[PDB]
């Protein structure tokens, strides 16, 4: 009945997708020169944790970064010195996410209790203290990013996203159109709109203000394990678990490059473009990271510093460093 | 060779490091236990005998040990996602129906067997011993493969043999027991299994595989 009409509409939408694919970015830029072997030396080793670290986020200063572990700690590192500014003892050790406000006075992390805590750093008493506890979700919380000093965003394991309101502790909006579990999201350079992954090999482009998905790209194969916007907020290269990173076009509405290499068969676990939008970094389950060429797809220098799988990595705001975190419980600030 | 304030920051870093070390030391002296099992099959009984919408952590103790039993049963997502979080758990308690030889809910007994087979081959748990609690025995006293003797004490033995033979590794031993103990003997079985697991784990650190 209506399912047949939906399939017919999908046929039309895929036909439209194909009708505007004169180029591929592969034949173009063929004459463009490559980038020499990118060699990066482990500059600093931040070694404080005692167990696997599952997430981290770079502060706005490009100097302070926060990481979380199953040990039940949030240590606010200092990159230029390797010091520990703060150590926040968590309530539920099962933590699988972190954030950092554009201002330096808020940090949030909630992994498996279905609630994300909001912490206060710039407090008169001098001790970091919990500020709220958002408990509307019905599944394990995957990723959560601050939008402003208030209005956090979240995506949980029950196929929903929230866009909370910190002052009232209420779900102002609720995004729900996903068929399966949601595994990660990312905010655009401007906070106008964001995207989310899924476990059904699909991605959706939400709208922050009014709740409805605007576009759905289904060029992927197995899963989604990481998303991140390309600078200028138009591509948002996507992770994977089929060993094939991809980057779609928000305006052309179709997958574009599909980076891949035969030798590697592992699940990607994180991705984050570089400052100039030329490099595409990707942490792999194969115990070592990699650096791609965003415009030619050729591989580049390997980052074989770590021991166990890489879980999280992020380029700074100014692009002066690249931090990675593996289940070895060591953060390495490359450069 | 540092300024007036930087040395204070270094002192703060040292204090934080010492506090982290102290917290870590007193956290490896307790025993973890992941509690899996087919739903609606003798789980609440074990939990109750032992002593929000997610991980429920029971925190009992028994004879100088400090058990922390993470009863994960709330998540409705596929287990492939949050299972790896428990890769360093000293054991995986398991509860089966033992009453599914007749009901079909496919018989729950076969479903529990398949789940146990899946949990016994996961790459994460290829080294963690497993405990079986064949609970709901009083009511227990199809599945027609051989069952020749057909008696209670032979059907139970056959099912236990199936479960124990579902494993195929040499460095993980599967224990067994039946519940409905007069006292809190179920914890006693868990205590014995934990002691044996720790002994066998410390005997592999000095060679002597």
């Amino acid at each position: 009945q209506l399912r047949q009409e939906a399939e017919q509409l999908k046929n039309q939408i895929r036909d439209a997708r194909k009708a505007c694919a004169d180029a591929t970015l592969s034949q173009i830029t063929n004459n463009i020169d490559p980038v020499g072997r990118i060699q990066m030396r482990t500059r600093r080793t931040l070694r404080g944790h005692l167990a696997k670290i599952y997430a981290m986020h770079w502060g706005t200063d490009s100097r302070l970064l926060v990481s979380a572990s199953q040990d039940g700690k949030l240590i606010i590192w200092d990159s230029y010195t390797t010091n520990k500014v703060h150590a926040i003892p968590l309530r539920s050790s099962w933590v699988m996410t972190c954030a950092y406000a554009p201002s330096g006075n808020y940090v949030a992390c909630g992994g498996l209790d279905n609630i994300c805590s909001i912490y206060n750093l710039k407090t008169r008493e001098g001790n970091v203290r919990v500020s709220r506890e958002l408990a509307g979700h019905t599944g394990y919380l995957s990723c959560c990013r601050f939008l402003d000093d208030n209005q956090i965003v979240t995506s949980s394991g029950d196929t929903t996203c929230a866009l909370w309101d910190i002052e009232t502790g209420q779900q102002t909006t609720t995004f729900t159109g996903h068929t399966g579990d949601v595994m990660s999201l990312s905010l655009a350079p401007d906070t106008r709109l964001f995207v989310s992954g899924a476990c059904d090999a699909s991605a959706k482009l939400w709208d922050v203000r009014e709740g409805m998905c605007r576009q759905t790209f289904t060029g992927h194969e197995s899963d989604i394990n990481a998303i991140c916007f390309f600078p200028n907020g138009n591509a948002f290269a996507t992770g994977s678990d089929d060993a094939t990173c991809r980057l779609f076009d928000l305006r052309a509405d179709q997958e574009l490059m599909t980076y891949s290499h035969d030798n590697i068969i592992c699940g990607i676990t994180s991705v984050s473009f570089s400052k100039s939008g030329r490099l595409l970094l990707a942490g792999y389950d194969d115990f070592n990271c990699n650096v791609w060429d965003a415009l030619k797809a050729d591989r580049a220098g390997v980052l074989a510093g770590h021991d166990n799988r890489v879980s999280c990595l992020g380029v700074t705001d100014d692009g002066m460093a690249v931090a990675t975190g593996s289940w070895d419980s060591f953060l390495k600030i490359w450069n | 060779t540092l300024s007036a304030e930087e040395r204070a920051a270094l002192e703060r870093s040292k204090a934080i490091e010492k506090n982290l070390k102290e917290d870590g030391i007193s956290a490896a002296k307790d025993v973890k236990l992941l509690l899996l099992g087919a739903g609606e099959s003798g789980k609440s009984t074990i939990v109750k005998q032992m002593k929000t919408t997610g991980i429920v952590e029971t925190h009992f103790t028994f004879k100088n040990l400090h058990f922390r039993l993470f009863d994960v049963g709330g998540q409705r997502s596929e287990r492939k996602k949050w299972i790896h979080c428990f890769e360093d758990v000293t054991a995986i308690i398991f509860c089966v129906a033992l009453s599914g030889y007749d009901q079909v809910l496919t018989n729950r007994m076969h479903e529990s067997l398949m789940l146990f087979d899946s949990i016994c081959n996961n790459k994460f748990f290829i080294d963690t011993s497993i405990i079986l609690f064949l609970n709901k025995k009083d009511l227990f006293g199809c599945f027609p493969e051989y069952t020749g003797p057909n008696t209670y004490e032979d059907a139970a033995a056959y099912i236990q043999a199936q479960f124990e033979s579902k494993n195929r590794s040499p460095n993980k031993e599967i224990y067994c027991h039946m519940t409905c103990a007069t006292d809190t003997n179920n914890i006693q079985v868990v205590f014995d299994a934990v002691t044996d697991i720790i002994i066998a784990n410390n005997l592999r650190g000095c060679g002597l595989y």
Epitope: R63, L64, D78, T81, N83, V85, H86, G104, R124, E125, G126, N127 | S3, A4, E5, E6, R7, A8, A9, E11, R12, A15
Partner: single-chain antibody, 232 residues
Framework: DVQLVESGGGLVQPGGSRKLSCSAS????????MHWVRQAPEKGLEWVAY????????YYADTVKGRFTISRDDPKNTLFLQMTSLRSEDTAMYYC??????????????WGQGTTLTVSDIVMTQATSSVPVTPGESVSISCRSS???????????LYWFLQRPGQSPQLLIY???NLASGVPDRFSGSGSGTAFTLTISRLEAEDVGVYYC?????????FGAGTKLELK
């Protein structure tokens, strides 16, 4: 609310001994660095002692070295100071402050009250102590050092403090470029690697106190001469 109060203020004779103390209740006192600062009937405002978070660092002022002892116990949130060989030069009212040192922190936040008692280094000067002024305009203070105050870390440790008449002072500007929370935006700070100055625009009926400037590049923090502002 945050408050620090003193315990022992009394009349003592030269050649005895007396012990000071304060009580803190509003914050997590167990992880703070507490200073001691003295004064005088004159504008004189000088450094006294110090104690760090873990009690592993204790500095002093050479003028009282070997006579003044400092110590505190975290569980009671109480600081103790012991004095001996009390000369008439010691007569002054002793303040007590707090300071927490980490990247991005503001030392010397909350200045408490003080007790009344009776009986090379860096040098800074503040010329033109007296400065007539009227409301509806800006002003400019300045204190100068004798050694470059710009450290290689990129920071320039220099603080400012305002003291209202009959009242303990409060932090005004730290590192000559940052404002302590709650201070209105009229105040501002700047300076080169050797010279420093403020710009207090739109003077109101409240900015009437005296100003001092601290140097923290070397731990014997030594303040500058007072620069009072009347309302001629």
């Amino acid at each position: 609310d945050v408050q620090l109060v003193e315990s022992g203020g009394g009349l003592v004779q030269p050649g005895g001994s007396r012990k000071l103390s304060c009580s803190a209740s509003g914050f997590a006192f167990s992880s703070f660095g507490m200073h001691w600062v003295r004064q005088a009937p004159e504008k004189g405002l000088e450094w006294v002692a110090y104690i760090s978070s873990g009690s592993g660092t204790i500095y002093y002022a050479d003028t009282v070295k070997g006579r003044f002892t400092i110590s505190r116990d975290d569980p009671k949130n109480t600081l103790f100071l012991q004095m001996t060989s009390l000369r008439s030069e010691d007569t002054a009212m002793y303040y007590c402050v707090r300071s927490i040192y980490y990247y991005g922190s503001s030392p010397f936040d909350f200045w408490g009250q003080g007790t009344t008692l009776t009986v090379s280094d860096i040098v800074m000067t503040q010329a033109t102590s007296s400065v007539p002024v009227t409301p509806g305009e800006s002003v400019s203070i300045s204190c100068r050092s004798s050694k470059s105050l710009l450290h290689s870390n990129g920071n320039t440790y220099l603080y400012w403090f305002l003291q209202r008449p009959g009242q303990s002072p409060q932090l005004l500007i730290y590192r000559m470029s940052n404002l302590a929370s709650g201070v209105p935006d009229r105040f501002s700070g700047s300076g080169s690697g050797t010279a420093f100055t403020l710009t207090i625009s739109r003077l109101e009926a409240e900015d009437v106190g005296v100003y001092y400037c601290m140097q923290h590049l070397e731990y014997p923090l030594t303040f500058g001469a007072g620069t009072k502002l009347e309302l001629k």
